[PDB]
Design a protein around this ligand. Structure first.
Ligand SMILES: O=c1ccn([C@@H]2O[C@H](COP(=O)(O)OP(=O)(O)O)[C@@H](O)[C@H]2O)c(=O)[nH]1
Ligand SMILES: O=c1ccn([C@@H]2O[C@H](COP(=O)(O)OP(=O)(O)O)[C@@H](O)[C@H]2O)c(=O)[nH]1
Ligand SMILES: O=c1ccn([C@@H]2O[C@H](COP(=O)(O)OP(=O)(O)O)[C@@H](O)[C@H]2O)c(=O)[nH]1
Ligand SMILES: O=c1ccn([C@@H]2O[C@H](COP(=O)(O)OP(=O)(O)O)[C@@H](O)[C@H]2O)c(=O)[nH]1
Lengths: 326, 329, 328, 324
């Protein structure tokens, strides 16, 4: 009996899926720690007889041995049915299971919240974006005793950082479809939106670029905006933003919405400003002098080796396996 | 973004050497930052064509175009399974390293019909790692035309078992099964023979029960000689394969006795790791005649050579060189 | 481009547990991609001041601004060396993790506390064996704000674990010159002492010759109980540290018996790894009574818990968390 | 007797030093393989007394033990005296020594030939020699180098994850080296533009675009947009520039003779040309499809350079050969 740690990893999604991006990046760190990938392909679950699905899963977990530990990165995006039966398959082994939450599907839409929580409760440790997320999940019946807070996505990279000049512009590499505040841009601060989609005056569309390029370009100065839409104001209070990690790894300060999860990280480390609303953000971008920009930048760049070396991830990947056995 | 993947069987008996080698190789591959494609040993005919195909899709779900895959063959799931795994792999734009642990039609007179199908699927790899040059030669004669070949040379035996000081015990160690090795029963000499096995034999042969490898290593290190031998039934294969027993003796820290004609025998010759003997009589005779002086030297050569074995360097180099060859012309 | 380095001592006797520890932490560290800053144990007074300085420049030659350095203390080259290594480290723009294996000023050695504390305080993060250790260190002026608790030693190993039978015997792989209760051993339960010392022992102590750790693990895994016991003058200083042999028993796969108030005692209780006893006499009683099933369970707890020990997870978490903390 | 592998690595040179860049790249690969760094700092050896030197060295190798293997990246650039002395220290341990040659000082010009005997003497204490090219090994043998086990490096790697942009057929030649070292640049006289990436002040001939020095990753991204990489100058060693071009994902043009050119030919990675004028011709005549093919070749071969495989093999093979 010789313990190995395995971790699930999705494959086959779009060139531009942040979801897969997250998992693959977590997995690369995990591989570097000695862990083993359980590759999972993103496909149409209805395409399998319930029996072919049982055996595709046997294919996926073929290397598993009792005494192992499995880190399940949820969701698989293969349907709650897949999630459920993957879990069920793992519960047949005499192993500890770490549930690593990237998103809670119902949070839209809301109905399957119950079957979601239900297989969640089968894990031994839960890793979640924030304590607020854990608290809110307990409210729906989540009863796993050992929980670990993720805090922040890393963003492992060796993209050169150029000196950050005080450009009074704002960067935002999300998609307008999901963020409608972007179409409502009123202010005379340029908003640089990085997206594939083609949809005001001061918003400037920029072509989707490989992540390393975006980082290099963003490092030349400016501010990074982390901002949700108005129903997404639920999550935001709960999830970890991926682009937040991308701003910080690039070496520029951030502007986040008052009430975002884990805001303490931003404050304690002097990484940017927590503002009430867009207006206040604009104001600060207009007010900030050369001095206080130079400070925020140096704060970001003394902080970001954590992000670029993948330590929030190495941290939770190590602690959760230990808590599972301990 | 190229990743390197390696297949690894699972599910066989704890006593199975085939799985033991594959796991060990995998353990070394993982340390090199490679990725496991786990494969479970089961009865292939409990699947419909659709199900087997989808079990394979599950096994290879993480592969992408541009990756490299090392197929550790055989899977012991049948030539049929090997062939369809290979077929799946060829749908990807990847390079395939075929790493041969055994050639199943060459190792049993009755498995020979499978030669042609085995070769056909061998010829789909970009690189073949074979135990010996002689095995590659033999493969060629049966139609194997894979242009790039790497010689494995020897099985490592990664470990940290204590090595005790080796005294000149005039005994011979043999951790194999009497079934696969019938000569055991016809043991007739007055030099003791220790047979380590889970399984009925002559007076000068002592049966010791199957221990976990680590303990076997510690015990063997106390001295004596490791015998690497095969019956005349397998004299053919012997000139071709790599013995795992060989690597276990040397890792333990004792000299070995091997039959003339065995694969990669110059390895033993040039590193002074034991004796190449014509027959069992010549070995028994050398064990009775060797003096303290000579045994001292042999043990010295073995324990200066065997860091390679214990740190997995034969495996590290084939794992590194084969992936390199798969890409570079 | 940040690298993590970790100090590691070399040159001590194959018997030195202090080196065995640093070396083990270092091995885990290297598997995590950290880099060794090798330190050799020698007579410091053989060095002129400038020689000592440049020997140190030799040790840290590979360091760069922006690196993170883990200092496993002490080096055993004496405090003067520890202090001079720390100052050398502070000359770089790096974050420093202090990893405490022992604290020298802890009775007549106490006078050294001022110097010891003054260099501890140059660290950004302190990893200490127990919270208790951290508290005592605070009473004497340690003010490093980020601290991590180690909570056990690991024992990474591949040692076969045999099935464990209930044997009413106690294993103690400790030097009997350092533990006196051994010479006083007066009980009908056999005490098995694994030691290099060529001396004879009380009637019911079985002197067993020193053996490679791997062999010791395998042998102990056949059953019996592992005793973690301190002398008497090492009693206060006891409560503080992490027992290395404790880790060895659990990694072998047998339950343990430890004195009341041992550092990180709750780990034993919360995981069902053995018993906390007042004194030897209670320990003898438990071993006399303890039944077959109750033992079976003790073992089950141990072997479900010990893959953490055997794969080095206490160390992996402290090496990972302390670096994170040094930057955060 | 637990064998560990160590590798020397220089530190403390300028950010522009290719020697350091190389030793550091090899070392990072070595660390991923589990090998341990012996960090060496570049200073002025005259500032040490004999005793101080001996103890600085003792500080550098404090972690070695009998039974280890040591890979010595030579030269250290602290001089031959330092290299000889480091080699002397190592020999005092019962270890095997791999000598990995980056440069041979006494072969740099005839003036430095007097150093050959000292150089060869200490080379000969090694158990294995890794050299850039077989040709180099042959030359060394002519001067008394007698280490029986040798390994050929072939090519520098270039570990990176720089995005590769699509390679447009730009009729331009990239050359990230400095002028004060390459005469041919100041003499440029072709209607084909030469993109020279340098930190130097100097203004440059008409059809040269002096581009400011830039981080390696950025350089790689820019070059991946297309055009040709030029390797120009001692066909003894491996060009580091070469690996940068191929990692960036564009084909190369190299001067006839240089070492290991059959790597170029056998993988269809560029052109081996007699002179500069031959290079301008091929850049003028080459058509769209011929160029898509070059790029195909380079981008299929690339992953070796980018994942550090020339280095992984020499680091694995040489340690193996040191014991076997
Ligand atoms: O041109 C682009 C724009 C987006 N991104 C990536 O997409 C991320 C943001 O995606 P998403 O909005 O889904 O992250 P979220 O903040 O919502 O968690 C950025 O940080 C980048 O990593 C990118 O690689 N190139
Ligand atoms: O008591 C035993 C006897 C055998 N072995 C293992 O079984 C191997 C021999 O198996 P096999 O005879 O199949 O090796 P090969 O024929 O390839 O030389 C030995 O080297 C050991 O590693 C073991 O672990 N415990
Ligand atoms: O025959 C022996 C006896 C001791 N030890 C090692 O020495 C440790 C105990 O040493 P020490 O008492 O110094 O550690 P402590 O428990 O006091 O921290 C054991 O756990 C073993 O790992 C060993 O390897 N072989
Ligand atoms: O703007 C620049 C110019 C050059 N270089 C680096 O310098 C290398 C060339 O160095 P050198 O000419 O010394 O190498 P050589 O080809 O002579 O071996 C390039 O490959 C780059 O990696 C760079 O990073 N940025």
């Amino acid at each position: 009996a010789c313990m190995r740690v395995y971790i699930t990893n999705i494959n086959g999604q779009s060139i531009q899926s942040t979801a897969q991006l997250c998992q693959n990046t977590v997995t690369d760190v995990a591989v570097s720690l000695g862990y083993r990938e359980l590759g999972i392909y993103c496909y149409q679950i209805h395409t399998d007889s319930e029996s072919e699905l049982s055996k595709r899963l046997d294919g996926i977990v073929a290397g598993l041995r009792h005494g192992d530990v499995v880190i399940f990165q949820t969701p698989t995006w293969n349907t709650t049915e897949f999630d459920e039966k993957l879990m069920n398959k793992l519960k047949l082994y005499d192993i500890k299971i770490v549930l690593f939450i990237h998103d809670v599907v119902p949070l839209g839409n809301f109905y399957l919240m119950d079957r979601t929580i239900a297989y969640y409760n089968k894990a031994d440790v839960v890793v979640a974006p924030s304590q607020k997320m854990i608290d809110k999940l307990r409210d729906f019946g989540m009863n796993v005793s050992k929980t670990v807070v993720q805090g922040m996505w890393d963003h492992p990279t060796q993209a050169p950082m150029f000196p950050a000049g005080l450009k009074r512009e704002i960067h935002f590499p999300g998609n307008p479809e999901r963020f409608s505040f972007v179409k409502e841009w009123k202010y005379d601060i340029p908003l640089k939106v990085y997206t594939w989609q083609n949809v005001p005056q001061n918003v400037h569309k920029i072509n989707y670029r490989p992540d390393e390029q975006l980082l290099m370009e963003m490092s030349q100065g400016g501010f990074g905006l982390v901002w949700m839409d108005d129903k997404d104001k639920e999550y935001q209070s709960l999830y970890c933003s991926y682009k937040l990690g991308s701003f910080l790894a690039a070496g520029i300060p951030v502007i986040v919405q008052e009430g975002i999860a884990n805001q303490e990280l931003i404050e304690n480390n002097g990484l940017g400003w927590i503002v009430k609303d867009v207006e206040e953000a604009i104001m600060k971008v207009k007010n900030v002098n050369e001095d206080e920009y130079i400070e925020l930048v140096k704060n970001v760049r003394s902080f970001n080796p954590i992000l670029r070396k993948g330590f929030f991830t190495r941290r939770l990947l190590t602690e959760s396996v230990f808590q599972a056995i301990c």
